[PDB]
Amino acid sequence: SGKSYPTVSADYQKAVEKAKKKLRGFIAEKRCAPLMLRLAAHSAGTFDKGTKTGGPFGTIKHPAELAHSANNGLDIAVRLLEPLKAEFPILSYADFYQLAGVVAVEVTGGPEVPFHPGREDKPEPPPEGRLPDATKGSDHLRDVFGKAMGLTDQDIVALSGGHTIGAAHKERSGFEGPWTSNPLIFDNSYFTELLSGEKEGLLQLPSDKALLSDPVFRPLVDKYAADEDAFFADYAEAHQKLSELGFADA
Ligand code: HEM
Numbered sequence: 001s002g003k004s005y006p007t008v009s010a011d012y013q014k015a016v017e018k019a020k021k022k023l024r025g026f027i028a029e030k031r032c033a034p035l036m037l038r039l040a041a042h043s044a045g046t047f048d049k050g051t052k053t054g055g056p057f058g059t060i061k062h063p064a065e066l067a068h069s070a071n072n073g074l075d076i077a078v079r080l081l082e083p084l085k086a087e088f089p090i091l092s093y094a095d096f097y098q099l100a101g102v103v104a105v106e107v108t109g110g111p112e113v114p115f116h117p118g119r120e121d122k123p124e125p126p127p128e129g130r131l132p133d134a135t136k137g138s139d140h141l142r143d144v145f146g147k148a149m150g151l152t153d154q155d156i157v158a159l160s161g162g163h164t165i166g167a168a169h170k171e172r173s174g175f176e177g178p179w180t181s182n183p184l185i186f187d188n189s190y191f192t193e194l195l196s197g198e199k200e201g202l203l204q205l206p207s208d209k210a211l212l213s214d215p216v217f218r219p220l221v222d223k224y225a226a227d228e229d230a231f232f233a234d235y236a237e238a239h240q241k242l243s244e245l246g247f248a249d250a
């Protein structure tokens with residue numbers, strides 16, 4: 001909503017479609033879906049609505065942005081995609097990385113997140129420090145997702161569910177381990193685990209836990225744990241919005 005998507009040529013659209021297929025095979029084979037989803041979200045999550053700066057505009061490939069502490073390990077993601085990107089010179093890096101995130105959700109069994117091409121690659125990375133801090137709580141989440149990005153409380157909880165795939169690594173964030181028993185399967189297990197309490201072998205970040213105690217976030221955790229279809233619907237909505245921050249009249 002509020003979006004006017006740009007026209008791209010037929011050749012551009014053809015390349016999107018071909019790149020989508022190549023990304024499915026590559027991501028599935030390399031077992032890197034969680035890392036690609038992180039790459040897409042960290043690219044998008046820097047958007048500040050008040051200044052219209054940052055966002056999903058290809059800047060995460062910049063050595064300067066990769067160097068941000070919140071981006072530890074994403075240099076691997078960028079390197080992994082470079083040979084594929086080279087097969088699609090017509091596409092912006094901006095579009096390619098968001099497409100990789102959409103594909104990451106799909107190949108792990110998640111919802112089909114709508115994708116619209118046309119993001120332009122911007123020259124300057126945003127300032128460091130805009131991405132969410134895992135050690136903080138509900139006020140912080142609203143500052144970053146709501147005040148900066150312009151997303152809703154519903155979008156915050158749904159997007160937190162992205163942790164249903166993947167794991168933290170002690171050499172990247174310092175945190176360690178998967179949120180779920182099935183880290184390459186996209187489902188509502190993140191919320192199920194968040195509710196059941198701490199289980200050995202599984203991770204919960206303070207930021208994950210903050211969902212449980214917030215008056216608005218908690219009913220959403222409950223809904224998603226009870227209804228995976230509702231989670232998938234809200235997740236697809238939220239991911240689309242995230243992937244489109246600052247893009248197509250924002
Ligand atoms: C809600 C606020 C968030 C916080 C505090 C947060 C924090 C973190 C941290 C600390 C890690 C571990 C990085 C590492 O050590 O490898 C991580 C990983 C991850 N994040 Fe988030 N994140 C948030 C939101 C999101 C969103 C919105 C998405 C996408 C929708 C997402 C997707 C992922 C995925 C898939 C991984 C696992 C990556 C892998 O397996 O290598 N996260 N997150």
Ligand code: NA
Pocket residue numbers: 164165180181182183184185186187189190
């Ligand atoms: Na899972």
